[PDB]
Design a protein around this ligand. Structure first.
Ligand SMILES: CCOC(=O)N1Cc2ccncc2C1
Ligand SMILES: CCOC(=O)N1Cc2ccncc2C1
Lengths: 306, 306
């Protein structure tokens, strides 16, 4: 027992991180097979980032202007192309450490691990969620761009995020591995307002189930509710609406605990209306929303990777 | 910017995890050079764990009774010895993935990463602290024993923890890699009371400095205090006493922020006496104590490993 914010083991992804330098800009690249993926803003000067025309900036770049370093080895660039907001740099050597992998575009409320890197070297790993406003609350310093977010299903790494931008408010924006930003964000140093950071209701309910499984039961109340009644209250507290699809996904945690999903919704409703009265749940004084139902099952059943 | 509970990248340690089976008991081992380290309670039956005599149980074990599996390969055991509460199993093959490593015994309040494993396979990585009562608040299920805690200094892994026990209260006990338990705990299924889980004051102050660096400044007050005045208040709230050694260690964060350590102590004192009034600091509604000063500097300066 015990319940922790747990990242995937990072070894498979560590073996894919490289350094990419264009002129005076250095950031991280992801080396899979004979392609290195990196943010296209590697081609920009600080000045350019105000109003970059990426197609025009690319005209003045050749294969030999992209410096790709894997530890101590230079990789030979034999081709480059822009796909949305990423560069694909073709190299003459397939990464010998390429794991089985996929590129997936995730939905808001889905969680993933980030391997924060500087100069192609891993600094740390942590668990994130795609927020409902399509930002993530990461830990990223200058030079972290091209750090990736991923999930692992046994031996297959699903890459879902590449880091591109910090907004003026200190939250983070980036792309999938096809270079499409999550949400309305652009790779330009302009005014980009994040919308309302709503709470991922289905994830709070998952984490309440995790709490019960781990013996933290004080918040279980004597009530039930309906989806409509719950959603009227949830909306007021900037909670995402709960759907029948969400209820269905929580079914297995409902069965393991014997607590009906709508009963757990009525417990949550009372926590929202009454607060935690200075109590904690799984060592938190607020309602955690960065565990999915799949995460809770995974961590509570000890599923393995390799 | 942004501030996350960040683990070390786990790849170096993933390459060291094996499965150890003795009779009907399976747990995890750590394979470094030609030695596998695992909890000695691998030799116990559920029945034995009530009152085990490990020396007597060991008499009935030979090298060929320890089944060591590294993925699909069996390792040949050519020697075994008991060191405190760990078994050292000599194998005929040096781990080709052995990183540079050390065995260190940590002090209460020090943090480390845990790679939670089942059947010698990594499930997840998370950051822990050695509590002042020498427990850790982990995430461990049956089969997790022999999972390790570690820190990395560039290319050298410092192993500081091996998982052995869950106490009746659902907190965790284990050893250093010489097999000496942290605190008074024993590898016996008996009544073992954890003492007071005090808050690691120096770590709370580090995290307050992290908050200021990341622009979360609302709690900065107009007061200062002294070590004695602060410590009288801290004691009342089951905070560890702050020493001049602690003040000295916070010196660099003091200098970067221009906030005197005793000023930050007076801010903390007001948070203890007044609570957070429903506000958050770095997205937490309680005072986080599982970041060291070295962790804050590391995460705020983007230090790298490889
Ligand atoms: C000029 C100082 O730059 C920063 O502080 N950054 C840029 C940057 C870019 C992407 N993620 C995080 C950060 C933090
Ligand atoms: C009989 C059921 O056993 C458990 O629930 N454990 C044992 C155990 C041993 C070490 N860490 C965690 C756990 C959780």
């Amino acid at each position: 027992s015990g319940f922790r914010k747990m990242a995937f083991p990072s070894g498979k992804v560590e073996g894919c991180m490289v350094q990419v330098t264009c002129g005076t800009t250095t950031l991280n690249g992801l080396w899979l097979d004979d392609v290195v993926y990196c943010p296209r803003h590697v081609i920009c000067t600080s000045e350019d980032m105000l109003n970059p025309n990426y197609e025009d900036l690319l005209i003045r770049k050749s294969n030999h202007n992209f410096l790709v370093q894997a530890g101590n080895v230079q990789l030979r660039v034999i081709g480059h192309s822009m796909q949305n907001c990423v560069l694909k740099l073709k190299v003459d050597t397939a990464n010998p450490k390429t794991p089985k992998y996929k590129f997936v575009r995730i939905q808001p409320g889905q969680t993933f691990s980030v391997l924060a890197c500087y100069n192609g070297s891993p600094s740390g790993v942590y668990q994130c969620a795609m927020r409902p406003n399509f930002t993530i609350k990461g830990s990223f310093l200058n030079g972290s761009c091209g750090s990736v977010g991923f999930n692992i299903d046994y031996d297959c790494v699903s890459f879902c995020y590449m880091h591109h931008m910090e907004l003026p408010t200190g939250v983070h924006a980036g792309t999938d591995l096809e270079g499409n930003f999550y949400g309305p964000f652009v790779d330009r140093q302009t005014a980009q307002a994040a919308g309302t950071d709503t709470t991922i209701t289905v994830n709070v309910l998952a984490w309440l189930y995790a709490a019960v499984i781990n013996g933290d039961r004080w918040f279980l109340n004597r009530f039930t509710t309906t989806l409509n009644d719950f959603n009227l209250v949830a909306m007021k507290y900037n909670y995402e609406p709960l759907t029948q699809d969400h209820v269905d996904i929580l079914g297995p945690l409902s069965a393991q605990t014997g607590i009906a999903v709508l009963d757990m919704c009525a417990s949550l409703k009372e926590l929202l209306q009454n607060g935690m009265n200075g109590r904690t749940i799984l060592g938190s004084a607020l309602l955690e929303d960065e565990f999915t139902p799949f995460d809770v099952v995974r961590q509570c059943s000890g599923v393995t990777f390799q």
